[PDB]
Amino acid sequence: SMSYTWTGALITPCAAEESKLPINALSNSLLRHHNMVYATTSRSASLRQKKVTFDRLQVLDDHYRDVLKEMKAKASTVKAKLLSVEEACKLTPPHSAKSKFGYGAKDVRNLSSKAVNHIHSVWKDLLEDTVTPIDTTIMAKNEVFCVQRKPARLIVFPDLGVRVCEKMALYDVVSTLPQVVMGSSYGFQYSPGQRVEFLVNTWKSKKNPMGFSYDTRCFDSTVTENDIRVEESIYQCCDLAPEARQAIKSLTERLYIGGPLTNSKGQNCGYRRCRASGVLTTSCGNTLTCYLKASAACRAAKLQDCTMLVNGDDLVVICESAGVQEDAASLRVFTEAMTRYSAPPGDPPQPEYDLELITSCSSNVSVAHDASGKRVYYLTRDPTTPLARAAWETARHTPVNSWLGNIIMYAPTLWARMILMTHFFSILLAQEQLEKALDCQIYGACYSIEPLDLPQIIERLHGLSAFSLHSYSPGEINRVASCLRKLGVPPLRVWRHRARSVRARLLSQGGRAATCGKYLFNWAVKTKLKLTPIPAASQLDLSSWFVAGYSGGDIYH
């Protein structure tokens, strides 16, 4: 069966699209090599269409059904609640795409009589009809990258009224089921610190550790009707209200398994028979299906003492090495099993015996030292894409502030501290916009965050030591330095100088502003202050930040 079929109508934009890096008076201070930064546009949709369109075959064996039985036994212990219309409305992002039916994201959030009545009638239709495919819009995403050019990614989503209904039937399920099912292998339950801790403690629990990441080529396209019906059977093990069972069956048949594709102008583009990337279950569905295939593939491969780490389509395995020749042979069998299961690799998997050389979720463990000289593991990544996007965001307001999400997720890193913090605090100060709440995304969900709150956020997520890491690894330093030469970003010595200034500028204003000065930029002074817990930190509500992923899920936290 083919992942998609097309009519030959084009995937169309719904607004002006820029591909070329916009330049303003601030650009050059961050990045000189402008022509290396670009955004994807609908003009490359055609190329993406060819990549994501193929035939899927699937051959399911006893290892597969064995892991599924287990997954189902654990799912059966979950009790999930239906959300009210009101609860589902408050989870809607203020800037979520409006409905074709005369109300938008703000009408929903306000419980306007029109939004609510439409939601009620879409809900009602879900209960009455488990057959008619639900319409979706297919769009090309505008995303910013550094060259070496990718084609636009595609997003496929139903109407707003449908999205609210999805939250009602499934929010509690997608938030609570995957950790019950997958235990410590479910990646989205951890903050980046907790994730590094889980990986180190897993690497260490092996006599002779071996690990690998596994990248499925176009994972969403590899998701078959079988896979999506199997996800449905797992959801349906939960102790649910009968009305919820019905809405879930309905959304599965009419939306999750497939449906017609419509462009921004109302033309039929074709039909989908694979994972929709802009539905509530995209993340949970991908995590379960990836975990189910991979667990069964470990058994086929006879890997010893496997520990998986799964975040949607992103997969890490750590196990007991059987020796280097045996390990390489085992990975080949794993890949064969994965592929029979319909999930062939993009890049063939490579066994690693060094934890820091495994990249998953584009990220890796590394080490630096705290104030006391002690070893600290933290999560980092290649900064090329973060810096490319910071340049873009320097010159344009965008819906999502990746610079802010990167500061939060990668606060302990040399590149987030020296460059991202320094640059954006200078920009914010000069506009007196430190208090202005900004939208960013973390594990796919949307958050509205005042820069002035960064210090307490970072402390909670990463702890105090994030403000005093130093003595980064040669490998990390070399990768950062190499990325700055590529993009023509000023060298770290310039950034320290700038940070002193930005730091001095912030200390003046006192209050929260001075706290950012003191905590964020303490690395920039020769004689470091002492950093002590910030009071307003445990007063903040952060539980609920790392419970589940919601990539494509239209979730506001």
Ligand X SMILES: CC(C)C[C@@]1(C(=O)O)C[C@H](C(=O)O)[C@H](c2cccs2)N1C(=O)c1ccc(C(F)(F)F)cc1
Residues found near ligand X in the complex (CB under 6 A) = 187, 192, 195, 311, 314, 361-363, 379, 402, 405-406, 409, 414, 417-418, 441-444, 469-472, 523, 551
Residue closer to ligand X, measured from CB, 334 or 447 = 447
**Which residue, 132 or 471, is less far from ligand X as judged by CB?**
471
Q: Decide whether 277 or 363 has the Cβ nearer to ligand X.
A: 363
- Provide the minimum distance between the beta carbon of 425 and ligand X in the complex, in angstroms, as a whole number: 13
* Closer residue to ligand X, CB minimum distance, 202 or 262: 202
Q: Phi, psi (5° rounding) for residue 477?
A: -55, -50
Amino acid at 415: W
Give counts: helices (H), strands (E), the chain. Answer: 21, 14
To ligand X, the closest distance from the beta carbon of 440 in angstroms equals 6
Which 8-state DSSP code applies to residue 437?
Answer: -
**Contacts by 26-29, CB closer than 8 A, 24 or more apart:** 26/394, 26/395, 26/427, 27/391, 27/394, 27/395, 29/423, 29/490
Shorter beta-carbon distance to ligand X: residue 40 or 402: 402
Cβ 517 to ligand X shortest distance, Å: 14
Q: Are 379 and 466 in contact (CB under 8 A)?
A: no
Please identify, using beta-carbon distances, which residue of 244 and 449 lies nearer to ligand X.
449
Smallest gap from residue 207 Cβ to ligand X (A): 26
Pairing assessment for the beta strands 363-369 and 154-157 based on DSSP bridges: unpaired
| Rounded least distance, CB 204 to ligand X, Å | 19
* Nearest residue to 421 (alpha-carbon basis) of 37, 5, 429, 52: 429
Residue number with CB closer to ligand X (63 or 381): 381
Pairing of β 136-140 and β 259-262: parallel
| Smallest separation (angstroms) from ligand X to the CB of 311 | 5
CB of 285 to ligand X, least distance (A): 14
Question: Closest CB to ligand X among 491 and 533?
Answer: 491
Closer CB to ligand X, 41 or 287, in the complex: 287
Residue 133 or 490 with smaller CB distance to ligand X: 490
Inter-axis angle of helices 384-395 and 422-430, nearest 10: 10
**Is 323 exposed, middle or buried (CB count within 10 Å of its CB: 0-12, 13-18, 19+)?**
exposed
Residue 148: CB atoms within 10 A of its CB come to: 8
Output the smallest distance, CB 308 to ligand X, in A.
13
> For ligand X, which is the closer residue by CB, 279 or 361?
361
Q: Which residue lies nearer to ligand X by CB, 186 or 235?
A: 186
How is residue 184 written in tokens? Answer: 């410590």
* Angle CA 348–317–342, to nearest 5: 50
**Shortest distance, position 371 Cβ to ligand X, whole Å:** 8
What residue number has its CB nearest to ligand X? 405
Nearest-angstrom CA–CA distance, 403 and 388: 10
Least separation in angstroms between CB 467 and ligand X: 8
Of residues 311 and 330, the one with the C-beta less far from ligand X: 311
| Of 41, 3, 442, residue with least CA distance to 220 | 3
Using CB atoms within 10 Å of the CB of residue 395, give its burial: 0 to 12 exposed, 13 to 18 middle, 19+ buried.
Answer: middle
Q: What's the closest the beta carbon of residue 228 comes to ligand X, in angstroms?
A: 20
CB neighbour class for 234 (10 Å; exposed up to 12, middle 13-18, buried from 19): buried
Q: Could you tell me the smallest distance in angstroms from the CB atom of residue 138 to ligand X?
A: 20
Coil, helix or strand for 67? Answer: helix
φ/ψ of 365, rounded to 5, equals -75, 145
Q: Who's near 253: CB < 8 A, 6+ residues apart?
A: 130, 131
Q: Are 254 and 524 in contact (CB under 8 A)?
A: no
- Whole-angstrom distance, CA of residue 283 vs CA of residue 154: 16
Q: What minimum distance in Å lies between the beta carbon of 361 and ligand X?
A: 3
Between CA 27 and CA 44 the distance in angstroms is 26
Beta strands, E only, 432-542? 438-442, 445-449
